[PDB]
Amino acid sequence: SNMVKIVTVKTQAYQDQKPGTSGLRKRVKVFQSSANYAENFIQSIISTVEPAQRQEATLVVGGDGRFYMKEAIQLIARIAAANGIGRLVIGQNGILSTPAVSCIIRKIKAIGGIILTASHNPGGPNGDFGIKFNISNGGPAPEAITDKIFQISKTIEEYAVCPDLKVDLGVLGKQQFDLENKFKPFTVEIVDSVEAYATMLRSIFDFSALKELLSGPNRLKIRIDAMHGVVGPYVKKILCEELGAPANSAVNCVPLEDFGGHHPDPNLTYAADLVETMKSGEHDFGAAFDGDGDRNMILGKHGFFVNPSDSVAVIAANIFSIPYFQQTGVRGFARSMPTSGALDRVASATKIALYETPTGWKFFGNLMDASKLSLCGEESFGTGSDHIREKDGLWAVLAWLSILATRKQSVEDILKDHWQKYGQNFFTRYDYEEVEAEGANKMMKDLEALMFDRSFVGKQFSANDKVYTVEKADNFEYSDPVDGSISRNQGLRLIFTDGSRIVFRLSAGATIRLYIDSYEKDVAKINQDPQVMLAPLISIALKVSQLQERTGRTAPTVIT
């Protein structure tokens, strides 16, 4: 029945419901076996909305398809209705990519959205579940708001719910619910998962040029792997149906509740199927997306790997292949500090501002909201623009296709031309996972003390046929030019006079991340194996940090 009662449910607070920057993520089993775990958190989110503003408010709700998503969406609808939220907009079947949620929030001027995703983390009966809150600019809720949610969640003693309310998520259109002894109805609009996002992309990119690129006998041959995650229907409906790529272009493009039993995390080993496909030489372009669609990996013919640090640089160097940027102009470029310096060479050569930010969304969002940031990238497979306030993997793929269309060259030839023009930033990230915290912290503190010494700048480091001179060494700090905040201890940087860098970052077991960025201006040495070219700087990095001595690790856990 669509005439439902409002009921107050006594509850007991949990103490660990901390939203963080990417949402509250817990094992699916925790949500299911902890009474009112989800309910308490949803209520805590909604309690940050001023009662007076709820009736005219809309929340956008959707997720990445993982197990438990639809049950959580029903819970959100039952609690939102009871709390006097006037409207929910929900993707069909509950499905909305994270970029789609950001798109819709900003399009319909909603107060925010609740995204049911744990991004690249596994899903399924034994996987993870995440609940992410975005606010009215379409982006992640900032710390002041997540702090409030957490504080409310720790002392909550009841929540309001319409236990008999049920939303049909499969069916497009408005469902109205009349609440007992409430004048105004509760309205749920089920929208097509893809339409609003596709329409945005239709305005950003030249779909006529892309159709021509992707169809016919001379078509660019592409393989696009959604990794059984949320981007699946977007690939099928935009790249295949609208832009005319053959249906086999869409790989793993049916969303699955367990992401096919694998991690929806795009890199050369988690997406090893796509890589093996590309190695056959039949296809010109490959890409893979993460579970909720804000990360992307870019491959060329024969499986040529475009480092995410290079990808944002190539997009920057060819940015006016994209109609959006022809119209807005380029307001600025940004990358996270550990990302390679390739983007900087394009910004310097084209005289556009380069913002080097700590890891995290808020720094990019601030700059975008100041009209100072058009294109951003992160070495962790992140690429985006100010078209929305989340990173956007499928957008990054259509950027590449637009560039491929105007350049009329292979992905590899585009990179070779790029390196010949700007030099090459050989780049890798070493992850040392689950190291003992005491050793890793001692490693960081000792290295920081050593770098702080007056004589460390100007020191020279040699290995084989390579001499590196320290130009600067510090613990990265960022004063945000919008909110005034000062972020400290964002990473140990060893900056060398030749344009190369070593960066150390720390992030239930500590993880050391070691980023190596070797700038090579010699045309003869471009397109080499990065691991070979980076070996001198890796040796210098392990020796000055004494990482093996402090952690007992002789090798990183993961190399990217």
Catalog residues that contact Mg ion under the rule CB under 5 A.
Answer: 119, 290, 292, 294
Residue closer to Mg ion by CB (options 383, 545) is 383
Which residues are identified as catalytic? Answer: 119
Residue closer to Mg ion by CB (options 294, 386) is 294
Minimum distance, C-beta of residue 340 to Mg ion, in the bound complex (Å): 21
The verdict on whether residue 487 carries a ligand-binding annotation is no
The verdict on whether residue 380 carries a ligand-binding annotation is yes
Residue 118: both structure tokens together: 């744990």
Minimum distance, C-beta of residue 240 to Mg ion, in the bound complex (Å): 23
Minimum distance, C-beta of residue 184 to Mg ion, in the bound complex (Å): 36
CA distances from 406 to 98, 244, 410, 502 (A): 29, 18, 11, 35
Minimum distance, C-beta of residue 378 to Mg ion, in the bound complex (Å): 11
Residue 338: both structure tokens together: 């550990």
Measure the CA angle with vertex 130, ends 257 and 132; round to 5°: 125
Please tell me whether residue 458 adopts helix, strand or coil conformation. Answer: coil
Residue closer to Mg ion by CB (options 290, 378) is 290
Residue closer to Mg ion by CB (options 114, 245) is 114
3-class DSSP string for 465-530: CCEEEEEEEEECCEECCCCCCEECCCCEEEEECCCCEEEEEECCCEEEEEEEEEEECCHHHCCCCH
The verdict on whether residue 292 carries a ligand-binding annotation is yes
The verdict on whether residue 192 carries a ligand-binding annotation is no
The verdict on whether residue 389 carries a ligand-binding annotation is no
Residue closer to Mg ion by CB (options 227, 526) is 227
Task: Give CA–CA dist 236/492, Å, rounded.
Answer: 43
Please tell me whether residue 446 adopts helix, strand or coil conformation. Answer: helix
Please tell me whether residue 285 adopts helix, strand or coil conformation. Answer: strand
Minimum distance, C-beta of residue 83 to Mg ion, in the bound complex (Å): 28
The verdict on whether residue 269 carries a ligand-binding annotation is no
Task: Give CA–CA dist 286/119, Å, rounded.
Answer: 20
Which 8-state DSSP code applies to residue 86?
Answer: -
**Shortest Cβ contact with Mg ion: which residue?**
119
Show Cβ contacts of residue 177 under 8 Å, excluding neighbours closer than 6 positions: 2, 3, 4, 81, 162, 165, 185, 186, 187, 188
Q: Which residues are annotated as a binding site for alpha-D-glucose 1,6-bisphosphate?
A: 25, 119, 294-295, 359, 378, 380, 391
Q: Which residues are annotated as a binding site for Mg(2+)?
A: 119, 290, 292, 294
Q: Which residues are annotated as a binding site?
A: 25, 119, 290, 292, 294-295, 359, 378, 380, 391
